[PDB]
Amino acid sequence: TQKTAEELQASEDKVNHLTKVKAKLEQTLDELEDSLEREKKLRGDVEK
Amino acid sequence: TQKTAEELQASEDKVNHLTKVKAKLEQTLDELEDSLEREKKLRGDVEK
């Protein structure tokens, strides 16, 4: 009873862990994405 | 003994699903950051 009650709690915290990793990483997706778009526009202007 | 089993397997799937999300999102951070140099040295020699 106890050891399967452990892996029940050993899942939910890791669920709670990686969600904070995922929610951080979607924000990390942002500051690359606008900066890549920034570069793309700058390059386009120079080429023009 | 059966109820802790069924909440266990759905949770490990949520462990299994969320690491599939992280595995997809890490290579995007590769594909974005590899594109960061890929524009930049292409913008650099077209500058000169």
Of A4, A18, A22, the CB nearest to B8: A4
Is there a contact between B19 and A19 (Cβ–Cβ < 8 Å)? no
Contact A4 B7 (CB under 8 A): no
CA distance linking residue B33 with residue B27, whole number of Å: 9
Cβ neighbours of A43 in B, within 8 Å? 39, 42-43, 46
Is there a contact between A35 and B32 (Cβ–Cβ < 8 Å)? no
Tokens of B46: 């077209």
Give the H/E segment covering residue B2.
none
Cβ neighbours of B8 in A, within 8 Å? 4, 7-8, 11
Is there a contact between B21 and A22 (Cβ–Cβ < 8 Å)? yes
